Amino acid sequence: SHMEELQNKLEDVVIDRNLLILGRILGEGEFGSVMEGNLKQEDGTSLKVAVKTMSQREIEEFLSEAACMKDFSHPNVIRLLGVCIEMSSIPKPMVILPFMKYGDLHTYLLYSRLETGPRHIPLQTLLRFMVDIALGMEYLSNRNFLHRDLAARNCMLRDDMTVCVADFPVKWIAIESLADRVYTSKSDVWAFGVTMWEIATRGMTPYPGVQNHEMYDYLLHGHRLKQPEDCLDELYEIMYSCWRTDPLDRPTFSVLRLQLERLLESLP
Numbered sequence: 001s002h003m004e005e006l007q008n009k010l011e012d013v014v015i016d017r018n019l020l021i022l023g024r025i026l027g028e029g030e031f032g033s034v035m036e037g038n039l040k041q042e043d044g045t046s047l048k049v050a051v052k053t054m055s056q057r058e059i060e061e062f063l064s065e066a067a068c069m070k071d072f073s074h075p076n077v078i079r080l081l082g083v084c085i086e087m088s089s090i091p092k093p094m095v096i097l098p099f100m101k102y103g104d105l106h107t108y109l110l111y112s113r114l115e116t117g118p119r120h121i122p123l124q125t126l127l128r129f130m131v132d133i134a135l136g137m138e139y140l141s142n143r144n145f146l147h148r149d150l151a152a153r154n155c156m157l158r159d160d161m162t163v164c165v166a167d168f169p170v171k172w173i174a175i176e177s178l179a180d181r182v183y184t185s186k187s188d189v190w191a192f193g194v195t196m197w198e199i200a201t202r203g204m205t206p207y208p209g210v211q212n213h214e215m216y217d218y219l220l221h222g223h224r225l226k227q228p229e230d231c232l233d234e235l236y237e238i239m240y241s242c243w244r245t246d247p248l249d250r251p252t253f254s255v256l257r258l259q260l261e262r263l264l265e266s267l268p
């Protein structure tokens with residue numbers, strides 16, 4: 001039953017706090033922090049992890065959402081290893097994920113334009129990053145799950161250079177979502193087209209010369225993100241289809257993933 005499936009997911013997600021050791025702080029914000037850590041596994045050995053730190057009803061919502069995320073199983077979606085709840089002199093929820101030395105995709109693109117960072121990224125690799133994101137989003141959308149914050153800063157790079165969707169912004173929000181609270185999978189499609197543009201420009205902020213407060217009017221007048229300098233005509237047509245006024249006219253993630261795979265195969 002629906003209840004039975006919920007109680008099952010719930011028992012699996014909690015990690016005993018004594019199996020975790022916390023290290024140094026990697027990042028900080030208003031909502032919480034990211035630290036490096038060690039997780040003791042079933043086989044007696046330890047794994048390097050990333051630990052994200054952040055009333056009974058709010059904690060219950062956190063545990064419920066974490067239980068759903070752990071249930072996801074796809075190579076292009078970040079895997080949730082588990083959760084811990086600490087206590088202050090206010091409850092402190094912690095989320096445990098595998099450590100990815102290359103970090104977020106947005107930072108990686110920027111570093112590639114500098115001499116000491118990763119090397120220049122060729123066209124074929126930029127397209128492969130897009131195919132990877134489309135594969136992760138296709139898995140999530142088929143299971144009726146909404147991301148709501150898709151952007152290059154929320155995509156992570158694995159050690160084998162595979163990209164996976166994760167979640168640690170007016171310029172990424174669909175035209176219908178700015179006019180009303182309305183948010184569907186076709187709104188994640190719009191955010192995906194903007195993400196493809198960030199990858200193709202190697203990390204540029206969307207809509208140069210356009211301020212956040214003048215965004216809704218800009219789109220209402222039919223203007224969209226401009227074609228990047230070295231971007232193929234066929235790739236621009238794919239990203240432009242993500243920004244069609246009527247959400248029903250926009251392609252699904254499954255249709256996008258196939259268009260992107262066919263384009264990559266056609267390259268020499």
Ligand SMILES: O=C(Nc1ccc(Oc2cc(NC(=O)C3CC3)ncn2)cc1)Nc1ccc(CN2CCn3ccnc3C2)c(C(F)(F)F)c1
Pocket residue numbers: 026034050051052065069077078095097098099100101102103104146147148156165166167168
């Ligand atoms: O990804 C998540 N957390 C996360 C990710 C990376 C991280 O940090 C790191 C860092 C590093 N490495 C480094 O920093 C190296 C360079 C130094 N390695 C690994 N990890 C710390 C935390 N959580 C997450 C939360 C929500 C959702 C989707 N939804 C849930 C329910 N829900 C309900 C309404 N909206 C929603 C949203 C998703 C999903 F994947 F499914 F998209 C994921």
